């Protein structure tokens, strides 16, 4: 959203500066890892459907079953199909909208719509 830095003044002595989002290149940043962060807009990805297994791995089934309607899925293609059928997000006569539902799921995951996190280091 922020394309260029801007100066903001508070307390008359300290000025706030916000720069665009910076990502360091690295071969270990395979697209799956980058996408689940807020780095990339999911709109431009070619195949959002293939990322659903990643969000399944990163989130417990309980959280989705609560946020997302009827559950019990395996072979997440089935999950996408069932969610599209339930939500009416289906293409014309009558295939489910695989791309749209997956894109919406990724948007929800990245924008904090569903609860998820990474376990902190071992307590000591």
């Amino acid at each position: 959203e922020t394309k260029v830095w801007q100066y903001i003044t508070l307390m008359k002595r300290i000025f706030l500066i916000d720069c665009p989002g910076i990502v360091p290149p690295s071969s270990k940043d395979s697209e799956e890892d980058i996408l689940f962060r807020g780095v990339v807009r999911v709109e431009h990805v070619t195949h959002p459907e293939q990322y659903i297994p990643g969000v399944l791995k990163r989130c417990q089934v309980k959280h989705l079953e609560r946020t997302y309607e009827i559950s019990g899925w395996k072979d997440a293609t089935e999950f996408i199909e069932i969610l599209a059928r339930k939500q009416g997000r289906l293409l014309k006569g009558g295939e489910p909208d695989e791309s749209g539902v997956s894109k919406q799921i990724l948007n929800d995951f990245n924008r904090g719509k569903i609860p998820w996190f990474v376990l902190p280091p071992e307590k000591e």
Binding site: K62, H63, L64, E65, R66, T67, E69, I70, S71, G72, G112, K113, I114, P115
Partner: peptide, 24 residues
């Protein structure tokens, strides 16, 4: 650094945490 009171900051009531919806 001052003390941090994490008892505040009421966590956002995401629909996932709520038990009102279930599918068991």
């Amino acid at each position: 650094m001052g003390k941090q009171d994490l008892g505040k900051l009421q966590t956002r009531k995401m629909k996932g945490l709520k038990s009102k919806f279930d599918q068991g």
